[PDB]
Design a protein around this ligand. Structure first.
Ligand SMILES: Nc1ncnc2c1ncn2[C@@H]1O[C@H](COP(=O)(O)OP(=O)(O)O)[C@@H](O)[C@H]1O
Ligand SMILES: Nc1ncnc2c1ncn2[C@@H]1O[C@H](COP(=O)(O)OP(=O)(O)O)[C@@H](O)[C@H]1O
Ligand SMILES: Nc1ncnc2c1ncn2[C@@H]1O[C@H](COP(=O)(O)OP(=O)(O)O)[C@@H](O)[C@H]1O
Ligand SMILES: Nc1ncnc2c1ncn2[C@@H]1O[C@H](COP(=O)(O)OP(=O)(O)O)[C@@H](O)[C@H]1O
Ligand SMILES: Nc1ncnc2c1ncn2[C@@H]1O[C@H](COP(=O)(O)OP(=O)(O)O)[C@@H](O)[C@H]1O
Ligand SMILES: [Mg+2]
Ligand SMILES: [Mg+2]
Ligand SMILES: [Mg+2]
Ligand SMILES: [Mg+2]
Ligand SMILES: [Mg+2]
Lengths: 323, 249, 352, 252, 323
């Protein structure tokens, strides 16, 4: 009686949503500490023993031993998605880690994954709209590029090196247009060059410090009633998900990640100006005035990338052993 | 039957269930885990089938049949492993009542000759086209259920079972939109018992009922004929296999 | 997962009785709590010595007792039809409709069946004192219980019931005493005088069965005094009810459709158990019955006599049933099935 | 053993009846092996009679108990034929087990031990000679067998291979009659069958010498009424044990 | 060296919040099916074997083998809290099962329990306000009491008995003012008597079918910005918690408990009239017009009871083995 066994049966309908969501959440909780200034490096010891302080998303996801196959996916798809924008990882992995958690609530409540993702799509459209109406477009004078390079260099090195490299990167691009710590300085300079280049290319320096995450989540919630039926549960999980960046920004600076966010959401609702997270006192601050800028080429792609990856990892029924 | 036409239905059930949801405009990806690293996500039924080692001869035959249909007609290759897992799933309810496989094969092969009579009838010229969505399946199902009211024989329950088995195509086009497969399929049945409502199908992207003469989905009546022929033939090629014995040559 | 353990116990309660339904019903050895072997065919005495303890099954037994005290027959109908109701509900809950959606479907179908029945009656009891009309018409009740000397017991019980009978009704099933003189010779039994049947068996274990048959017999005379309407027995009325209820379900739209069609397929489980207890194939005879009932015979039922699946008219054969005995049977069976369908998550109670 | 309901329960009851008969089989005949059954007092009882072995035997199985009660009932009123009855009953049960392993169903085996038994008692009351006597020592079970199989050949339906197994199940009485004397049954029975095919409706096993002998001339006689009662009682015991579907043991 | 062991150490800070919340959630998931018409009875087999169909909260919580000690508490405190209001259990246990779940999210996020409960208090005050402004007070004619008794009798028995007892209970109170199924009928009649009595006593028949739960949750959300700082996370967990009653009402009638609730919240926001859950078609319905009424003595206490129990079970640091 040869060959009578129906093998290959794993992960039925939720058994795979649960696995993939837990893997995404683990990958989020690994990179959660490295976001923003006042973050935290990682070691990345090789086989020979070459340690490498590597506070960033690209070098980390591209070089660390990621055991879970789903997280290995999310990293192979997230690394290959930050060479068209320069650097927007460590925010992709987190936002995905909330599009997949804020959806687990409704999914466990009995919703179908392909109903949330419709809400994800509508929310992405409204978010791109609100981001195209919030871009502050100004001249790329040496003054502004100083800020757009300092905010992207303090992200990878402390304010000792990130206050002498800003000049060297804003004067190495204004002249072209028309050891375990040398790798770190090299990567930080290549990332400040890419940041100032993306700021020069389009001319939009849309505010940072999580201000646009807060202002993009609250406009969504004000837009939720006008979308559809159960689709609303996709714009209320894409709203509380573009809200960890301020939450984790506050968490990395030793603050309670619910009082600062509440103060920010209140001060944003009072004065109507998009307000961010001050990383020194925890009080809300106007990122446009203080002089912190993101790129309209990095947050325009942080939505596409996060939404695509999250929808794809929500749209899985079985995980089967191939050959 | 015995534990051989019920161990060939569980292989067919397994193969159908693996790809059942990879159907429609609202397909749902699957994860293929290789030995070393694994994950490669694809919502394409064929690749999923061409990459899983089933090792069971019944499943090996369903995969083989599906590949041949794909390399012959192209479209309608994941609607063949389904309607062959589903038409086998309903066969087991009669092989448990001591009904010889010859009787169900004499019912399947009889339902087919009436299955390809309404596709010729509900078709529209410019060969011809057949209403897409679930309309063609629900129309054929209702036609067979009305033709099975004058059977007066023991091969009358397997006749209705095939009819009600051509509902897994709407049952999945509704399950992938998030809608309730029950409250909507009953409405489809209700719509199809009327005179002219033979083109009412399922909007594969919204999960609502739409007349396919107004949504504009139509499938050529050569991938809906080869699909049904191949399904009801893989359903009588796995039901007449009494023993899986060794072979040396 | 807790409403399926209830159904999977009402099934096993209905399988230890299903096999004792027709005149060809099996005959199992019920060890008494006192260890006294009385192999009996009656399937109401089986429940007495089975003592089903699963509470979900206990409710079907309580409905069976209600049928046993409201009327005197149909005790198997109440727990071979409720068993089919729940077996098909489990076959319908897995589609996912809900407990709620199939209970009200069953209630609608039962309301329908109680309006089809008075249109299925085909005979009556014109004179409840004419002794051949009380023997040949009370035969089926004993024939179903004691195949063999069905007509001798029929006449001997017809004599007793007709004798003690006023001009107004007031038949007392407790009037007819049953002596059990341990003699020899079934034929030697007679009716003395309130009446009394001496019932001379042979071994005081083949007249206890006859005593239960006499119970079922005179119990049919009591119901015959209240409702004269008689319906064709041997699966005829069941198949007709199933046909008409299936038609009604096909007309009616909504989710009640499935539950109504399942209620009809639950009525088909009576002639299925009638035939399966005779050797003939069940599907063959259900098809041969549905195909002659579609033409409009309306009175044809199972032919127990032949070896192969056969159909026979039940009016001209005299194998009838009682209207009230099936009205109450369907009512109590539906009420029992919908009850244990409601019950979910059987909790233990607090020690009082 | 499964012994749950249906085929398993019937097979269990059949095996129990086989055991209870096997405990008496060698006692059949004029000269039969004795049995040394001892009570709880240390008394040694040697008795070659089936009646006095069943009245001194612990029957703790239901089917075996019913068979033993029917045997005791035969012994009480009639006397002769209380081990031939249980032998015929257990053999009727043994020769339908191969047909009850499939889905033949007992209700049909019961409409084969009642038509065949009625026909056999008719044949006895038609062939008996004068008070009416029939030749014992076989010579009936070797004739009722020949008659019942030759009649079952003319039955279209399922009762052909059940009466033909009822007939084959009568050859045990003329078999253990010579299996107890040690006479190489498969030869004396072959001679008896060959001699009953041609003629000789009274030819049965001889016990003085290992050969067939006309048992009517040899004055080894059996009252026709006794044979009819034994056949009917054995067939009714069979039907009883075949008509049992489950054992409802009260929990308490 | 006698007696040197510091025993009695269980359940530290979360180890007890987790245990108590899981116990409350289990007790909710046990009684979740019995809410509303089209509910589901329970068996309650005793030691002797006396089965008892017991679809209600009082007889259930008061007579069932509740293993978990915390759930045993919640039942000893919930049973002793529905004799001053008549009958409001099966809604207490559920709402508590969401005040304790909708708070587990924020608590696991790093919040302190005594911050949510402040929000619970503010939300309770606003809910009592909105319930005192929504009470429809009308004459207690025999017509209205028919509805107030039918809606409370269909809750305990099917519409066969609950359509012949309404008259017997509205004519046994309009003449006093100035077997396992007999216990069921007796309790249903005592509960219809208590319901009509509470309707007569105050004169307010505030709508039911979950309409007031929906209208009380949305007014809260419209009131959330004006409360305080992190207290807002107590009025957004007391808002999505007075929202299971419609959710579970829809779930018990075989509907998806996210589409019906969305349709109800949309239709309530359009017409501004408080709308409930139609248990036959799943579409929103006006409970005031259809003729389903709750009591302003039962929902006035459903807030106090649920809030008190939930705040108390959130305010636990240790579970210690006493003597
Ligand atoms: N000095 C700063 N103060 C406040 N927020 C900052 C500052 N610098 C960067 N950020 C914010 O930190 C967020 C995340 O940056 P990070 O994850 O460290 O690198 P990347 O920008 O590549 O994701 C950015 O959105 C930015 O707005
Ligand atoms: N927009 C649509 N809405 C509804 N049904 C659709 C739509 N597009 C295709 N379908 C139907 O979906 C079914 C599945 O087709 P597909 O998943 O492409 O695989 P295949 O047709 O090769 O089996 C077909 O019956 C088709 O008619
Ligand atoms: N001679 C017969 N031929 C066919 N069917 C019969 C015959 N006698 C009775 N029946 C049917 O089989 C049933 C057997 O009755 P039984 O199950 O013992 O009683 P009940 O189920 O009413 O307690 C009868 O009610 C009738 O429907
Ligand atoms: N002298 C004999 N020769 C041949 N057969 C005999 C003789 N005596 C008895 N038999 C056979 O032995 C069988 C068993 O009889 P036995 O055991 O003596 O008493 P019982 O008939 O009560 O069992 C009878 O069927 C009879 O035909
Ligand atoms: N006929 C009905 N239609 C819709 N909702 C109803 C109906 N009857 C009662 N309800 C609602 O069900 C809710 C819960 O009642 P239930 O939990 O069954 O008993 P209790 O009112 O004692 O908690 C009530 O708030 C009521 O508004
Ligand atoms: Mg950066
Ligand atoms: Mg296709
Ligand atoms: Mg009866
Ligand atoms: Mg003798
Ligand atoms: Mg109530």
């Amino acid at each position: 009686v040869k060959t009578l066994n129906p093998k290959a049966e794993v992960a039925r309908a939720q058994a795979a949503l649960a696995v993939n969501i837990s893997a995404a959440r683990g990958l989020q909780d690994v990179l959660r500490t490295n976001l923003g200034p006042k973050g935290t490096m990682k070691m990345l010891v090789s086989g020979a023993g070459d340690i490498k302080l590597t506070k960033d998303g690209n070098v980390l996801l591209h070089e660390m031993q990621i055991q879970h196959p789903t997280a290995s996916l999310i990293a192979k798809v997230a690394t290959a998605q930050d060479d068209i924008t320069g650097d927007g990882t460590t925010s992709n992995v987190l936002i995905i880690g909330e599009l997949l958690k804020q959806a687990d609530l409704y999914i466990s409540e009995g919703l179908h994954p392909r109903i949330i993702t419709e809400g994800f799509e509508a929310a992405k459209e409204k978010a791109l709209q609100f981001l195209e109406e919030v871009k502050v477009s100004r001249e790329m004078d040496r003054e502004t590029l100083i800020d757009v390079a300092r905010t992207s260099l303090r992200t990878k090195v402390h304010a000792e090196l990130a206050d002498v490299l800003t000049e060297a990167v804003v004067d190495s691009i204004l002249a072209i247009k028309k050891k375990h710590t040398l790798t770190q300085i090299k990567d930080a300079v290549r990332d400040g060059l890419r940041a100032v280049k993306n700021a020069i290319d389009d001319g939009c320096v849309v505010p940072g410090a999580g201000a646009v995450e807060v202002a993009m989540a609250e406009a969504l919630i004000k837009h939720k009633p006008s979308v559809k039926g159960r689709a609303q549960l996709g714009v209320q999980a894409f709203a509380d998900a573009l809200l960890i960046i301020p939450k984790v920004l506050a968490q990395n600076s030793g603050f309670d990640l619910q009082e600062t966010l509440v103060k920010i959401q209140a001060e944003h609702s009072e004065s109507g100006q998009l307000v961010g997270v001050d990383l020194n006192t925890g009080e809300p601050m106007v990122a446009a005035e203080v002089g912190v800028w993101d790129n309209y080429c990095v947050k325009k792609q942080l939505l596409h990338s996060c939404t695509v990856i999250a929808t794809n990892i929500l749209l899985v029924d079985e995980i089967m052993r191939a050959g | 039957g015995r534990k051989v036409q019920s161990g060939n239905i569980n292989a067919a059930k397994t193969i159908a269930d693996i790809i059942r949801t990879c159907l429609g405009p609202k397909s749902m990806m699957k994860m293929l885990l290789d030995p070393m690293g694994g994950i490669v996500m694809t919502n394409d039924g064929n690749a999923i089938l061409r990459e899983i080692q089933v090792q069971h001869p019944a499943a090996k035959s369903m995969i083989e049949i599906s590949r041949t249909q794909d390399e012959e007609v192209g479209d309608g290759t994941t609607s063949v492993i389904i309607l062959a897992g589903e038409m086998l799933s309903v066969a087991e309810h009669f092989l448990e009542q001591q009904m010889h496989p010859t009787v169900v094969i004499s019912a399947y092969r009889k339902a087919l000759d009436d299955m390809i009579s309404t596709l010729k009838k509900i078709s529209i010229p410019v060969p011809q086209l057949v209403p897409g969505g679930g309309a063609s399946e629900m129309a054929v199902a209702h036609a067979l259920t009305e033709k099975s009211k004058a059977m007066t024989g023991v091969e009358q329950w397997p006749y209705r079972a095939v009819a009600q088995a051509l509902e897994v195509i709407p049952r999945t086009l509704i399950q992938n939109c998030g809608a309730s497969t029950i409250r909507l399929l009953t409405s489809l049945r209700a719509k199809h018992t009327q005179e002219n409502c033979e083109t009412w199908g399922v909007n594969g992207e919204t999960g609502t009922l739409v007349d396919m003469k107004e949504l504009g989905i139509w499938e050529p009546l050569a991938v809906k004929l080869q699909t049904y022929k191949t399904a009801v033939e893989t359903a009588v090629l796995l039901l007449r296999i009494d023993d899986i014995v060794s072979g040396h040559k | 997962e807790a409403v399926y353990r209830n159904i999977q116990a009402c099934k096993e309660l209905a399988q230890t009785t299903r096999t004792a339904y027709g005149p060809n019903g099996m005959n199992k050895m019920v060890i008494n709590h006192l260890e006294k072997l009385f192999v009996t065919n009656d399937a109401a005495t089986i429940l007495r010595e089975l003592e089903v303890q699963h509470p979900a099954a206990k409710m079907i037994v309580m409905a069976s007792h209600m049928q046993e005290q409201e009327v005197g027959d149909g005790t198997n109908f109440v727990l071979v039809f409720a068993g089919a109701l729940l077996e098909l509900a489990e076959e319908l809950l897995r589609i996912g409709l809900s407990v709620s959606e199939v209970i009200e479907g069953y209630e609608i179908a039962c309301r329908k069946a109680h309006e089809i029945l008075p249109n299925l009656v085909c005979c009556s009891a014109k004179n409840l004192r004419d002794i051949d009309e009380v023997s040949s018409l009370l035969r089926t009740s004993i024939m179903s219980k004691q195949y063999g000397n069905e007509v001798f017991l029929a006449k001997l019980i017809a004599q007793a019931c007709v004798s003690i009978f006023p001009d107004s009704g007031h038949f007392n099933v407790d009037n007819i005493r049953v002596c059990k003189i341990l003699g020899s010779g079934i034929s030697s039994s007679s009716v003395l005088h309130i009446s009394t049947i001496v019932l001379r068996g042979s071994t005081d274990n083949l007249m206890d069965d006859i005593e239960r048959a006499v119970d079922d017999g005179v119990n049919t005379f009591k119901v015959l005094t209240r409702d004269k309407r008689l319906v064709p027995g041997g699966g005829a009325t069941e198949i007709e009810l199933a046909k008409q209820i299936t038609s009604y379900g096909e007309t009616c739209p909504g989710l009640e459709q499935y539950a109504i069609k399942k209620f009809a397929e639950a009525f088909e489980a009576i002639p299925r158990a009638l035939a399966e207890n005779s050797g003939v194939k069940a599907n063959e005879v259900i098809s041969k019955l549905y195909a002659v009932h579609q033409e409009g015979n309306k009175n044809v039922g199972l032919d127990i006599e032949a070896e192969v699946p056969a159909v026979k008219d039940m009016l001209e054969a005299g194998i009838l049933d009682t209207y009230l005995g099936k009205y109450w049977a369907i009512k109590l069976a539906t009420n029992a099935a919908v009850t244990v369908l409601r019950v979910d998550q059987i909790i233990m109670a607090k020690p009082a | 053993t499964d012994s749950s309901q249906g085929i398993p329960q019937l097979v269990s009851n059949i095996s129990a009846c086989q055991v209870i008969a096997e405990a008496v089989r060698t006692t059949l005949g004029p000269r039969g092996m004795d049995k040394l059954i001892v009570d709880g007092r240390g008394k040694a009882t040697i008795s070659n009679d089936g009646a006095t072995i069943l009245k001194l035997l612990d029957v703790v199985h239901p089917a075996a108990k019913t068979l033993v009660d029917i045997a005791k009932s035969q012994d009480a009123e009639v006397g002769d034929g209380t081990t031939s009855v249980t032998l015929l009953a257990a053999e009727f049960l043994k020769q339908v087990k191969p047909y009850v392993e499939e889905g033949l169903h007992p209700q049909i085996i019961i409409r084969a031990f009642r038509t065949a038994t009625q026909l056999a008692v008719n044949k006895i009351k038609e062939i008996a000679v004068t008070d009416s006597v029939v030749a014992g020592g076989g010579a009936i079970e070797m004739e009722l067998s020949k008659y019942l199989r030759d009649y079952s050949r003319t039955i279209p339906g399922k009762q052909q291979l059940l009466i033909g197994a009822y007939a084959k199940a009568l050859e045990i009485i003329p078999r253990q009659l010579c299996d107890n004397a040690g006479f190489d049954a498969t030869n004396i029975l072959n001679k008896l069958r060959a001699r009953h095919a041609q003629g000789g409706t009274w030819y049965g096993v001889d016990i003085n010498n290992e050969d067939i002998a006309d048992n009517f001339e040899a004055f080894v006689w059996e009252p026709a009424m006794v044979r009819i009662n034994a056949l009917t009682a054995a067939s009714e015991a069979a039907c009883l044990i075949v008509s049992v579907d489950e054992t409802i043991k009260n929990p308490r």
